[PDB]
């Protein structure tokens, strides 16, 4: 079992569920259609947000195509929107691939940051490692039993 963690705005938590589309479900975090395990999300406004705002959080806006499910790597190279070749600094038809957040305590709901953890795993095909709590008993043999 492995867990994934990040901070996303509460207005887009619905995009986490499989089968959704949007800015973050296409360029940041795509979840496969067949999914086991589940996700836990809750509001984190007392800790993450700042009175003057928080700007250290980034999110991708522009990508050449929708990314395959479960992509983690990121490249900060310059993006060109129009057909004009673009190098050095951005500008006309050249947009920076990422953008920041802004979190104020004065913001209403749907804008305060949220902390999200995602769980996923496969079911009983290989020798299991993570197991639940239950007592182990003796191994009886050659008798009608319920194993």
């Amino acid at each position, epitope marked *: 079992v492995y867990a994934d963690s990040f901070v996303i705005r509460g207005d887009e938590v619905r995009q986490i569920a499989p089968g959704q589309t949007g800015n973050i479900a296409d360029y940041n975090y795509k979840l496969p259609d067949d999914f086991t395990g589940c996700v836990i999300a809750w509001n984190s*406004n007392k*800790l993450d947000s*700042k*009175v*003057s705002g928080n700007y250290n959080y980034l999110y991708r806006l522009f990508r050449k195509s929708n990314l395959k499910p479960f992509e983690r790597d990121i490249s900060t190279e310059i993006y060109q929107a129009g057909n004009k070749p673009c190098n050095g600094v951005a500008g006309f038809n050249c947009y920076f691939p990422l953008r920041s957040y802004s979190f104020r*305590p*004065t913001y209403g709901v749907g804008h305060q940051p949220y902390r999200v953890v995602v769980l996923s795993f496969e079911l009983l095909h290989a020798p299991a490692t993570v197991c639940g709590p239950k007592k182990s008993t003796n191994l009886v043999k050659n008798k009608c039993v319920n194993f």
Partner: antibody
Amino acid sequence: QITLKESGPTLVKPTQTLTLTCNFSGFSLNTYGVGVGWIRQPPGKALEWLALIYWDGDERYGPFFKNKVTIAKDTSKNQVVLTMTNMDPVDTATYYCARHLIPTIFDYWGQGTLVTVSS
Amino acid sequence: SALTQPASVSGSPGQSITISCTGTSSDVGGSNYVSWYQHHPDRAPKLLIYEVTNRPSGVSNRFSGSKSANTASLTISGLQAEDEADYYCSSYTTTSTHILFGGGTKLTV
């Protein structure tokens, strides 16, 4: 437990600049989520917020006193230093240094020091 | 600034009396974060309200608060000699992180 202590000169010449220190003792300021700010109250009137600094080196000053004040922190000796410039007789006030949190705006205040302007 | 508060309120010991801090709804915003501090002379003020009708550890159950449309009201029950002090309102604002409230002194006899 945390004590906020203010130290600095009380009498200042208007042409001269002012420096002040708050030697907080009892929290590590580096903890994620805690800030510290400065509040002054001139005699006869209400208080007045000056500025505040965050744990991760994020600084917020007053809308009017951006150039007048400068803030810095030293977690090794657990101190914060504030610099005020071209003060006025109206600016004479009692100064406090205070812990700042998001849910509880301001919780614990230092005892403060009086500041007056004369020759 | 653009925020106000009545300064003086009077009452009688043993009864209940209230004061309010008032401003403009636009500056404070939809989210309130109403807070109230007390200050007797000769030592630093401390916090008695940090959230809507909420009081931290070191409680004094006689304290109470209530956030109206554009005001925050502080109410005291069973008055004694400790009321003769100045009580400050404090709320988050939008354009600046200011409170700038005069504070409320209390009278009793």
